[PDB]
Amino acid sequence: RTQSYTNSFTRGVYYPDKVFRSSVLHSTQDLFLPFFSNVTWFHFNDGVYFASTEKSNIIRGWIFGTTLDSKTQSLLIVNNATNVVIKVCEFQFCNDPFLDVESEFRVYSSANNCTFEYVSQPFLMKNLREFVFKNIDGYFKIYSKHTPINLERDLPQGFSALEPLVDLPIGINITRFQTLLALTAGAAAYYVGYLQPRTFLLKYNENGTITDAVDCALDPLSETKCTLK
Amino acid sequence: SFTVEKGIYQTSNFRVQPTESIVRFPNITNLCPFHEVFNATTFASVYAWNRKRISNCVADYSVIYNFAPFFAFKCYGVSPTKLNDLCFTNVYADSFVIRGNEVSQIAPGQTGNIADYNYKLPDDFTGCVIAWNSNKLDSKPSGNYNYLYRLFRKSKLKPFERDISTSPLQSYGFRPTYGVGHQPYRVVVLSFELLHAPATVCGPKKSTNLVKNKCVNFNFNGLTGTGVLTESNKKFLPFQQFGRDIADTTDAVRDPQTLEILDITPCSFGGVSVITPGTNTSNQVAVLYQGVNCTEVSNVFQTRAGCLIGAEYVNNSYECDIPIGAGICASYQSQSIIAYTMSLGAEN
Amino acid sequence: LLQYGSFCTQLKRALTGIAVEQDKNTQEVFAQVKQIYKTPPIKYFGGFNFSQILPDPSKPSKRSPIEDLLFNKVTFNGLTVLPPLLTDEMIAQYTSALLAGTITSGWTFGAGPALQIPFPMQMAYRFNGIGVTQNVLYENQKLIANQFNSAIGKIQDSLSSTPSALGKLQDVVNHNAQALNTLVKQLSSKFGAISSVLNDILSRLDPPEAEVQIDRLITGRLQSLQTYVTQQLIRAAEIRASANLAATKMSECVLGQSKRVDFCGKGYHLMS
Amino acid sequence: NHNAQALNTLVKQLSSKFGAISSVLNDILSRLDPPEAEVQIDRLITGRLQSLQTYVTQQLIRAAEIRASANLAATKMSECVLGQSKRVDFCGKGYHLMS
Amino acid sequence: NHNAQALNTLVKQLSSKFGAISSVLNDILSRLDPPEAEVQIDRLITGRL
Ligand SMILES: *[C@@H]1O[C@H](CO)[C@@H](O[C@@H]2O[C@H](CO)[C@@H](O)[C@H](O)[C@H]2NC(C)=O)[C@H](O)[C@H]1NC(C)=O
Ligand SMILES: *[C@@H]1O[C@H](CO)[C@@H](O)[C@H](O)[C@H]1NC(C)=O
Ligand SMILES: *[C@@H]1O[C@H](CO)[C@@H](O)[C@H](O)[C@H]1NC(C)=O
Ligand SMILES: *[C@@H]1O[C@H](CO)[C@@H](O)[C@H](O)[C@H]1NC(C)=O
Ligand SMILES: *[C@@H]1O[C@H](CO)[C@@H](O)[C@H](O)[C@H]1NC(C)=O
Ligand SMILES: *[C@@H]1O[C@H](CO)[C@@H](O)[C@H](O)[C@H]1NC(C)=O
Ligand SMILES: *[C@@H]1O[C@H](CO)[C@@H](O)[C@H](O)[C@H]1NC(C)=O
Ligand SMILES: *[C@@H]1O[C@H](CO)[C@@H](O)[C@H](O)[C@H]1NC(C)=O
Ligand SMILES: *[C@@H]1O[C@H](CO)[C@@H](O)[C@H](O)[C@H]1NC(C)=O
């Protein structure tokens, strides 16, 4: 776990609602990832932007919890080759839990109690995978995007929307999150950024796909652009 | 006045009435677990209350009417009589038992020990509160002290939260010898979240068939109104349901039962103008429907200003007498009302 | 709403008055002459070349090249737009009549019957009206004709090059668009009510409890309409003043020769 | 005509209710209890104040136009009557002689 | 004189009550509960508009 600092650039734009628009310049106000921010490089707060580019499929699932104890229900997502499972069951996490590859003893002691259960098609599929995780007013939202990329150590420059992927009515306490691995030692890298409230000016095309955005609080020129629409 | 001078006057407007009504709703007929919420014969204490998220089912409330003779039934955001037509985004159920004298303690903009130390509500709350006596069920002859209530706390409770940590807790005394004002009443708080959006728990009513190219009322899972439904061409992505424009108005709908895009257009409307010479001259009139083609209604003549009825078009050109619109004028001439293209002046 | 009074009659009357005034402005500016004069078939006027301002018979709409460039260079819930009474072709015919009358007669057709006069003689008369004798014109005819031709030629390029040369005409359109957009965007406000949709309020509350919510919407919408109407009246006054000035200029700089300074351009006036 | 109709509208605006049980002060004050009658009074107060404001604004807007016309008349008196004017089409159609 | 009179009137209009319990926001907020403070705030807002 070696830290690094890098620049976010123009990444992390998602559709705020489920309404179709075209040939308009709309203005919205929500939690976002500000343009050109110091995102951290690994080898929760309001929300999380996660970015990965590995191919070995060493990464799958996440841990979300407040007390990190089985006494209180803690969100736990597992992702394997054929399905994805979301358990809001009670889990007693180990010191450094991970997938054994295939027992679940090291992931958790046991599930004495459980509330929510979900199973569906796995999220995961040169290529960059981006995910936005955020919970608000007792709801969990996960947005995702897969995009082919060229050879580039840092994040690509451009625009790409984050289509909605899943919504869950979980309604629990989340304060901290940790990364799950399925391991023989090795190395991996991923990018983490944090979201805070912002006002944005989103631009739509004739097909209804977001193509450009403006951060209204970045510099005076952007404020002028926002006030002139 | 009883005499009208020569000219053109605007009298009123016209609109196209709807033909019929179209209702659409999901296939499913799952019944909501409201019965499970009720007649449980065991309800939690006032300070320790359970939640429940009702979803993916049909909500019927007349079963609550046939369930018990409720003592108190208050609603704030909606009207009690027509709960059977709305569709709510989500439902939150709170169930507990409180002393009969404390029924009115819990309410928005209200203060009380139960109000501030057991359960709190927001100022803009939307929902209902139901209550009725259960003395014959939850009152032991020697006293039912299993029900407790909190009385002491450093801080007031926030809206929509549960507290279990724990003498602040005092046990109740319920005996059949007691009268009104002390017997236990069971109470349920129902909370909705109206969002004028597609929702899980709709009403019991049933859909109908779908029509096109006809002015008609519609009700698509709460999207009510009137208009003309036609086939659409917009490229809706799987999560796209509605549609808007620069003016922020609905212009497309996703059909629930058969996933398809439907364009909505407003029905025809406009103004009506009356062309007449003086009453002392003649007694006939002509009518102009502004900005409407003649299909929407000497008999007919289509101009740029709309549809003209009662006037005869002619080749010749004269000086303008009664202005109509884009270069057209009307006049009285064995005798009738004619319309023509005005003349700018004699050639030279 | 019927309990609030008779505001709607006042609104309708004000809007109708504005529209009638709009028609009268154009009528007063352009419909000066009584005859439709026509230019002769042979366009030779002593060396002066008017082809840039006379109507072009090749194109269908019968407009001069400069008029074409000007035409090309300028670009609901109970709200309707009414068409103007005079089409563009009629205005073009008025303009062509004025040009033919001024080319073939001078200032005589504005005071009575039109009387012929050769163009160089008219130009000599106009020189004699600023303190210069006729022999100055008659001995420098070709130089003056060439200078006039070049000056006319430069106008199309001057109009095309400068971007904001026609800002005055664009401002009217922009203000009308902004006012209408604001008026229609005001419909989605709540004004301290449960919702901005009357259908939802009528289908979620008892009849006695709905009036309290409906009154707020009614008051807000009445206030919005009143503000829009007042702004429209104030703008109409300014437009009327502009139209009056334009009519004065048409009568004094086109139908005659003006002695007022800087009224018909910078220099000594000759024609327009 | 306009000066008469404006006054008639202003007078006829008194009998409107503006969202109150009655459109007369004496009856509504005699019957109802003041602690809830003051709001009913306030509604009428605002309703009538708006009518007064509208009337005054319209009168100002008309007065501006009348002043413009009066200035034009003063100029025509100074130029066409006290002298002979060379401006085309300012003192009638033709060559001006007098007025 | 006209400009000065207009500004002075506009400034002095801030101390009117417009049929509310007071003309200071801070006094109303720090005395009444939030569900009733708006009933008095809206009148002040309308008058100032
Ligand atoms: C009047 O001026 C016009 C504009 O320059 C002349 O039309 C040009 O004529 C030349 C030669 O005939 C052409 O090469 C140009 O393309 C023409 N210009 C346009 C815009 O069509 C016209 O010839 C002049 N009239 C006379 C009698 O000389
Ligand atoms: C599981 O739930 C039971 C009650 O159903 C509770 O007594 C027990 O403590 C819970 N287990 C935990 C919190 O680990
Ligand atoms: C993957 O997860 C699903 C979820 O139940 C499980 O059924 C399956 O056995 C797991 N393994 C494979 C190889 O699919
Ligand atoms: C959630 O956990 C945090 C941190 O332990 C705590 O401060 C908070 O009170 C808990 N509950 C909610 C509703 O945030
Ligand atoms: C919009 O969609 C049309 C039809 O699929 C397509 O031809 C056009 O290229 C699209 N516009 C883009 C991709 O900018
Ligand atoms: C609803 O029923 C129709 C007709 O039987 C069918 O075509 C459609 O697929 C059904 N949809 C769902 C979600 O069950
Ligand atoms: C005639 O009415 C139809 C509507 O049915 C409209 O589409 C069409 O444009 C109208 N014709 C003309 C010439 O305006
Ligand atoms: C004049 O009358 C003829 C009759 O054949 C007609 O074809 C033509 O359209 C008329 N001209 C108009 C209506 O302007
Ligand atoms: C101008 O005068 C000449 C004589 O030199 C004549 O041939 C010509 O026709 C005249 N122009 C016109 C338009 O008649």
Numbering used by the authors:
A (entry chain B): 24 to 66, 86 to 143, 154 to 177, 187 to 244, 259 to 304
B (entry chain C): 305 to 470, 490 to 620, 640 to 675, 689 to 703
C (entry chain B): 753 to 827, 855 to 1051
D (entry chain C): 953 to 1051
E (entry chain A): 953 to 1001
From the publication, what sentences describe this entry?
At the end of 2022, the XBB.1.5 variant emerged, a descendant of XBB that acquired two substitutions in the spike (S) protein, S:G252V and S:F486P (S:S486P compared to XBB.1), and a translational stop in ORF8 (ORF8:G8stop). To gain structural insights into the recognition of the ACE2 receptor and evasion from neutralizing antibodies by the XBB.1.5 S protein, we performed cryo-electron microscopy (cryo-EM) analysis of both the XBB.1.5 S ectodomain alone and the XBB.1.5 S–ACE2 complex. We determine the structural basis for the interaction between human ACE2 and the S protein of XBB.1.5, showing similar overall structures between the S proteins of XBB.1 and XBB.1.5. Our recent report showed that the S486P mutation in S is a determinant of enhanced affinity to human ACE26.
The XBB.1.5 S–ACE2 complex structure was also reconstructed by cryo-EM analysis in both RBD one-up and two-up conformations, with resolutions of 3.04 Å and 3.20 Å, respectively. B Cryo-EM maps of the XBB.1.5 S protein (same colors as A) bound to human ACE2 (gray) in the one-up state (left), two-up state (middle), or RBD–ACE2 interface (right). A common feature shared by ACE2 receptors bound to the XBB.1 or XBB.1.5 S protein is that the N103-linked glycan of ACE2 is positioned towards the active site inside the ACE2 structure.
